[PDB]
Amino acid sequence: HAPVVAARLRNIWPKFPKWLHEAPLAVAWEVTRLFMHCKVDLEDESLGLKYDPSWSTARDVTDIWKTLYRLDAFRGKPFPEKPPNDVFVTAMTGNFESKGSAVVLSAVLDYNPDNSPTAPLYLVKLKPLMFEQGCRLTRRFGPDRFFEILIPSPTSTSPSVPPVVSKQPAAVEEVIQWLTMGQHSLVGRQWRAFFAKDAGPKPIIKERVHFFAETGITFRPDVFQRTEFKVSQMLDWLLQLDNNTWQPHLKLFSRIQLGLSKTYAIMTLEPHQIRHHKTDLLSPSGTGEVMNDGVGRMSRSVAKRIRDVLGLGDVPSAVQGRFGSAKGMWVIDVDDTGDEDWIETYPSQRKWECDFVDKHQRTLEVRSVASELKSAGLNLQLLPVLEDRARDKVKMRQAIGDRLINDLQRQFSEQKHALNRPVEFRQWVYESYSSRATRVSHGRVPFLAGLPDSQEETLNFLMNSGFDPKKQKYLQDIAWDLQKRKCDTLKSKLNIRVGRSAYIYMIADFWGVLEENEVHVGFSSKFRDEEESFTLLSDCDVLVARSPAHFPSDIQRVRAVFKPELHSLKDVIIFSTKGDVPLAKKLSGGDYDGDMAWVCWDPEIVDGFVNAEMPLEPDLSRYLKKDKTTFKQLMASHGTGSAAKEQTTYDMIQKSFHFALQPNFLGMCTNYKERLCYINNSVSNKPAIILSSLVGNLVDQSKQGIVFNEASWAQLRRELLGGALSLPDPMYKSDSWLGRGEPTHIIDYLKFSIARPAIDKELEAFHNAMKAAKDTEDGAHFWDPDLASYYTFFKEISDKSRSSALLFTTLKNRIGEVEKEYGRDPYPVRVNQVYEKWCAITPSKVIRLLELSFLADREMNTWALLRASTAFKLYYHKSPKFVWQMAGRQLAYIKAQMTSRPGEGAPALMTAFMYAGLMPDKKFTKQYVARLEG
Amino acid sequence: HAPVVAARLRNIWPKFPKWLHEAPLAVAWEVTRLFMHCKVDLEDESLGLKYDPSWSTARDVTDIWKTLYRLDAFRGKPFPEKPPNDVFVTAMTGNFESKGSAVVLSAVLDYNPDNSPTAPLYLVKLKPLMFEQGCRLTRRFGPDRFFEILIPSPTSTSPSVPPVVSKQPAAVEEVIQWLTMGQHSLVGRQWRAFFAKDAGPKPIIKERVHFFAETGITFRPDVFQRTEFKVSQMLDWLLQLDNNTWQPHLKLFSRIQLGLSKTYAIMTLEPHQIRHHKTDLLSPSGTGEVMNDGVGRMSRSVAKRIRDVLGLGDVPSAVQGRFGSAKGMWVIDVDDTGDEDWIETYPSQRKWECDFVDKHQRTLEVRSVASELKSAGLNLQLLPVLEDRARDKVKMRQAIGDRLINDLQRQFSEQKHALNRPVEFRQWVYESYSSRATRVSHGRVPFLAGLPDSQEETLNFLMNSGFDPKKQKYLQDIAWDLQKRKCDTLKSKLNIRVGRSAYIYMIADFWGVLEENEVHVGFSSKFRDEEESFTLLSDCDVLVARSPAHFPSDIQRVRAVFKPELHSLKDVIIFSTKGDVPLAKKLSGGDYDGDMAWVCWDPEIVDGFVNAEMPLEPDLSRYLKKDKTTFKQLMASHGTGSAAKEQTTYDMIQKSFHFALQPNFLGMCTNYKERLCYINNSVSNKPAIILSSLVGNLVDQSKQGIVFNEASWAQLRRELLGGALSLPDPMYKSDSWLGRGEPTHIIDYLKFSIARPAIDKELEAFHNAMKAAKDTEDGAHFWDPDLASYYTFFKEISDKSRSSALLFTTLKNRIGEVEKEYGRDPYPVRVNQVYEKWCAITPSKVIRLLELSFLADREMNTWALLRASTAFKLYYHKSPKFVWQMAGRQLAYIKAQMTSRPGEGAPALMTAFMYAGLMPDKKFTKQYVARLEG
Ligand SMILES: [Mg+2]
Ligand SMILES: [Mg+2]
C-alpha cells in the first residue's frame, strides 16, 4: 500500500460492454481487438452498438471487422494483424482445442507513455488468437480458461522506467498486490494470477504472468460452458498439496511450470503398468550417491507408441518427458523382449508425492526426443578450461589458431571455386541458407516489388532465367553483400568448428556393462566429418563437458567403449553407474534429466588434455541464505481445514511472486567472473574457484529458496575478492584491438592476431578483383544488349511510328517520373509505393497486343516486357537499383526468351507455387560439371 | 581346310589406300568410316583422292567429313554416328589415352546377306572412336595397339545362319583358322588374334575377339610410334610363361582376361611393401581346407589411397582387385595402426607364378569397391530352396502370398493418395524413375517435338506450368499408361521385396573372433526398412545364400554377432575362419574373391528355416572329362628354345579358341534342371541333386578343361535320368494360367492365384473411376478455356479484322493441313517431320508484334502462343494427341501466364538448362501439404 499507484493501476483492462455480453469468447476477444487498435471506445453510445447476430456464425474474423468498419469511425487502417481462419474456427466451434493445439489468449503490456494518476500506468495490447501446443493444465481445464501477459518487470532498474514507479520504493509490492490479490475482469471472465516467470535503447525486461478464469458471465457454481473453479483448487489438483506441505513453498510454486510445459501427450498407462521405485540406483562404493538422477526405463512398446503418435521416422531410444510428478528422461530397456507397455519412476524423478490416480497423472507427456546428431563445434567458453587443462598450452594455442586459419581458407576456396559456373553458384547459394520454411509458409517465394525478399533467393531467381554472376554487376553486388555480411558475423563467438564433436543427451547405464570411466556412444546414422564417417565410437579417448564449463574438472577425458549389449541405444551417450560419483555430477554438477554433454572425439583436442579432480569448494553459507519456510509453516498462520489451506495457497503465490520478481544475480556474478578470470587470465586460481562455485549455487536459486541480494554480493566481493569497483570489459568485447601490444588472452589472440588479419586478407582477395573487371571478356557489366531487346524493337516501330511514337514517348516519360520517385516509412513500404506507381505505368490494335487484357495478371503482358526493357535501356546507366528492383521479374523473362536457341531445349514457364517447390539437384550439378571438365 | 570358305573370308577388311597412308591412325579410322557408310570405294580413281593436309590438325571429325562431302558422291546422309571431340583429340594428340581412359578401336561383323564365293561372308562396320576405361595391357603397350570385334559365333545352330557355313561341317575350323593363323590388315596395321570370349527373330550370338597390332606401316624392328612386337611376347610379358608351363593351357589362356580387365590403377607398391604368403589360412580341424580362398589384407594407408585416387566419399573397407598374378578381395587389416603402405597375397589368390618385378606387376588395380548397400528382395530362384528348407511349408507359402498382396496393396494406396495434389504427384512421378543421367548427358530435358521424350518428364513439365492430373485428360492418360506398364512388369520375376535383405561382399575373419556359425555385419550408414533402421546386425539369426541356390544346403541359417574388434569393417559380411569347411564353400561352392551373399535378417523368413548338411554328390567323371594337357606337353611337339616356345604359345591360342567356341551346356543343363525340378516339384530328390551337381561342375568348365559334348549330355540323361525328350516349359513361362485346376508349384500359385487376381483387382480400382469423371467439378476434361485464350483474343480482332481476318484464316487453314499430316519411319522421325511442318506455319505492325524476330528461337514468339491456342480451340476435340505433341510447350506457357494472379507471386521463366538441374523438394512437399491439412 503505497499508494501512487494506485489510483494508477485503475482500470487497466479494456471494458466489457453490455451490447457485447452475448459473446462468444472469440468474438469478444477479436472485436475488442479492432476497437483498441482503431482507438474506438467500447462504451460509446454515439456509434449505435449493437451486436451482429452474423458474428456468431463467423468463420473468418475479417467478417466481424468489415462489419464494422463500416461505421466510418473505423478506418483504420487496416489491421489488427488478424487470427488465421483454422484458429478462429477452432476458438469458435472447436472448444479452443485442435488436436494437440490450444488456442492462446495473450496480451503484452507496456508502460503508459502518458501520466498523472489517474492514467492507467500500463497500456494493454491483445494479441490475435493463435495456436500453441497445449499443456497438462489446458488439457485438463480447457485452453479458454488460461490467459498470459508479458509485463514490464517492476524491479527493472532502470532508467527508462516511469518515475511514479521506483522513485517510490515498494510499490513493487503494490504492482504484485494488483497482480495477485484479486480477480481481473477481461472479456467477461474473472482472471486470477497463479504463475509468473521470465519471458520465453536498452528495453525494460518483461515477465510472463499466467491467469486462470475462476468465473465469468457464462460459468456456474459449484461443489457440486463451464463451471466456477478457484486457482487454489486447480493448483491442488496439479500438486496434490495435502501430501506436499513439507516442501519449501518457493520450490513447490516452481513446480507449477510442469503443468504449463508445452507437451505432447502420448498415451495413458494403466496403474499395473507403472513401476515406482522406492530407491534410486546408488553408488556401488557406499557414498550413497545417486547414479541415475532423473532417468528411468520404459518398455519398447511405449517407445514405439511415441514414434507412432509423434510420427517419427524411427523408434527413439530416449525421450525427455513428464509423467505424474515424475520428470526427466526415459530410456528404452534393452532387456525388454516383451510387448507389454510399462514405465518406471525413481525418487530423483518425482517432484511431489503423487497418487497417480487420475488419467492425467498417468499420461506420458513428451517434451523432446533423442534425435539425429549434428556437429557441435567448439564454443569459446569451453576454451579457457581446455587451455587450463592442456598438457602443453603453447602448442594447444598454436594448433587452435592454425585450425581457424585453415577452416577459413577452406571455406573461401570453396566459395570462390563454386562462383566460377551458374549451376555451381546456384548450388552454393542454396546450401548457404535454408529458405524452405519461408517457402512452405507462403506457398511460394515471397517478393518485394520485382524481386524476391531474400538476397539468396534473388540470385537463384535471376540465374534460373540465365543471368551469370560473373557477367552481370547487380548479381555480382548481391553475391558479395552476402559474403561481406558473413565475414562480419565471423569476426563478431569464436565457434571454431570441430567436426568430431556433438551435444548428446546423457543417460545412465542401468545394465552394469560400463566400467567407471567408460562411455557408450552409438549413432542412429552416419555422422560425417569431411573425409571420415562414424556410426559409433569405440576404442578412443573422448572429452565430455556440459556447457558452461567453469571448474578445471568441468571437462573430463574418458574412454569411448562400444558395448554390444547397448547397441540399440542410439543418439544418446551412456555413462557408467559404477564408481564413487556419477560422471554427470562432475560435468558442472549435471545429471540425467535432459542434460546434454559436449562430446568430442577429435584426436588433436582430446590428446593433450589432463583430468583435474573435483575442486574443494568454499563454504558460501554466509552469503547464500536458503528461506526454508514450508507450506505447513505458512498454513499455521491461518489454522486448519479447507479455508486455511486455500488462503495458504494464495499466500504461497504472493510470497513467491515477491521472490520471483527480485533481480537476477546469476547474470551479474557470471559477468563479474568473466571479467575477473579475464584480467587474471586464470580459471583455476582461488578467486576463479570461488566465483564458479558462486554462480553454480545461483543456478538453482529459485527452488533452493536462496536469498542473495545486493548487500550480500557486495559483502562477498569485499570479503573474498575485489574490487567492488567495476572490472573493465575484456578487450574482445570491442570490434578492434584496443589493447596494448599483442593479445595475451587466448580469445584476444584468436580474434585479433589470427581471425581479423585472415578475414581482411581473405576479403582483399575479391576486392581486387573488382577492379580486375573493362573488356577482358569477361568481365562484369550492368549492360546486357539482350535486355534492351523490346526497347529497340519498339523504337524501330516507332520510326515508322506515326503515333507509336507518342505511346513510346509517354512510356519513357512516365518511367522517368517514377525513377525520380525512387530517388526520394519502413523500407519495404516505400519500395512498394514506388512499385505501385511503376505498375500504374499503363498503355486498336497495337495497345491490345501489348496489353493482353485477358490475362488477370498485368505483369505478364508484353507491355510489362517493353516497359522493363525501355527502363533498362534508359537507366541501366544511371539507376541500376531502380530498374532491377522494379522490373527484375520481366528482365528475367526477356533474358530467358532471348537466350533460347532452336533445338537446344525448351524454357519452362513455372507458376510461382510450383517454382517454390523445387531445389537445386546437387548430384546433377556435380555430374554435369564432371562431364564439362572431361 | 574346307574350303568353302574360302575363298569366302577373302578379303573381309576394308582396304587401306595409298593416298591415305600418311595416316594418322585416327584419321585413317574415321575417314574409312565415312567411306564404308556412304558406300564409297576407297580405291576409287574417279574421285581424285587425295589427302587433305588440314585433316592432320583436325580437332573435330566433322571437319574431316565436310571435306569430303563435298565431292558430291558423299551425300549421304549424314552420319556415321561420329566420335566426340575430346575423344578424337585424345586419339589425335593425346596418345589414345586420357588419364584412365583408353581410346577404343572396335568393329561389329554380321553375316553378309549376299552370297556366292567370292563375296566376303562378313560385313564389317567400324564403330566410332570412343572412351572406355583402360586395362593392364593397354597401359603397358598403348590403347592404339588393341582392336576388338563382335563376330557371329560359327557354331551357332541355327537356323538364320548362311548354308555355306554349317551345312559344311568343320569349316568351324576354317573360321578359327582365318581368325588366328595369320595377321589381319586394318587401317595400315597388322592385327593378330590373342583372345576370344563371350560378349559383354532369334539373333545369332556374337563372340568378342581381341587383336594386337604386331606391326604396321609406322612401326620398326626390334630386339633391340612404335616398335614391332609379337603376340607371343606380349602374352609372355603378361603371364611369365617360363614359370607356368605346368598349367593346363586352356586355363592359362583364360587368365589373359586378367590383362584385359577394365581397371582402376591405384598405386604401385615397392617390393619391401609386399607380403607373399606361402600358405593359405587352413581349417583349424586339419581338413587342409582353405579358409580365406581369394582374400587378403591391405594396410589402411593403401585403402586411403584408393579412396583418394577414385574420389570416394569414404575409405572403403574392402576392394575387388588385381595385383600381379593375384586376384580377389583385399580387406583393411583392423590391426594396422601404422601409416606404412603394404599389401599381402595368398596362394589361392595367385593365378600364375609371378616375380612381381616390373612396376605393372606391383600396381594395385581396382575392379570394384565395397559400397553402401541397398535392399535386395527375394528372387524367385531362392524360393524352391527356401520352401524345401521350411519347417512348415504350408505356412511359409501362405505368408509369402500375404506379403505379396500387402506390398501390392501398399504401393497402390501410396500412388492413389499422392495423385490427389500436383506437388504430391510431381514428387511421386520424380521418385518413380531416375532422369538425372539423361539430364546430365544432354545438359537439359530432351524433347520430342513439343514435349519431353519421357512420359514421366512430360507429366512434371506440364504440372510445373500449372496443369492438374485430376483436371486435364492428356495428363491423366499418360499418368495411367505409366501405371499400366508397371503392372505389366510385375506380372511378367517374382522379385518379392524383403526389406531386410541385401547382397553383401563376403570376407573371411583373419582375426579369429568369429566362432563357426557366426557372422559379422556392420553397415556404413543407416539401412532403412520402412518403420525400422539398422547400422549393424547383432543377436539375431540370419539367412545367407549365394545366387543361384540349387542344393538344399545352398542357403544357411547362422548367427549375426557384432564384434567390436571388426567394428571398422563396413558394408561387407565377415565369415568365420573356424570349423571344418568355410561357410563360403557351403554357399554353392563359393569363396572370397568377389562373391556376394544374399543376407536376410527378416524374422518371418529366417525363423522357419532348417539347415541341411552338404549333399553326397555323385561321381560324374564318365560324363565330365577334364583335357589336362599342359603347355609343356604342347611344347614337346616343337622342341626347346625361343622359337619352340613362340609356336607353342600360338598353338595354345588356336586350340583354346577351338575350345572357347564350342556350344555352352551350362545354359542348356540349367534349363533342363529347371524343367525337371518343376515337374517333380522337388529340388532335393536324386535327379535334382544330380543336375545341381552337374551345372555346378560346368560353371568352371573353361579353366577346368572339362569336355562335355552332346553325346555325353544325352548319355547322362539316358543313364541317370529322363527323358532325352524335351521336358515341357513350366506353366509360369506363359502369361496366363494354362494349367489344370489350381497352381501347385509355388511359383504358379504366386503368379496365378495371388498376383494376377490382385493386379487385375487393383486395376479395376481406377478404370472405374474413368468413368466416374461429367461435371461433378471435377472431373477431367480435354477442354480448358485458359488455353483458348489467344484464340479468342485474335478472333475478337479479327472482327474488327479487316485483314487480320485473312491472316487468322490462313493460320487455321494451315493448322488443319498439318493435323491431316499428323493423321497419316521409326516413330520419333515421323513425329519430327510433322513438327517441322508445324513450325513452318509462320506469319506492319501486327505481324511484327506476333513475330518478335529479334528472338533467335521462333518458338518463343507470341505467334507460337496464338498458333498453339488456335490449334487447341480447333482440335482439343478431335485430335488431342496432335495438339499436345506439337504445341504442348506453348500450351504450358499460356497456362502459366493465365493462372498468374497479382500479388500471388511471380511465375519463373527458366532456361532449358537451368530447369534440368532442379528436382522436387520432398521436404517442401511434405511440409506444405502438412500445413494445407491443418
Ligand atoms: Mg539436469
Ligand atoms: Mg568367387
Automatic annotation (TrEMBL), chains A, B:
Positions contributing to ATP binding: 255, 327, 351, 703-704
Keyword presence, ATP-binding: yes
Catalytic activity, EC: 2.7.7.48
Domain RDRP core: 125-754
Binding site for Ca(2+) 1: 589
Binding residues annotated for Mg(2+) 1, in chain numbering: 293, 591, 593
Domain of life: Eukaryota
Sequence similarity: Belongs to the RdRP family.
Identification of the protein by name: RNA-dependent RNA polymerase
Source organism: Neurospora crassa
Residues of the full protein shown: 390 to 1372 of 1402
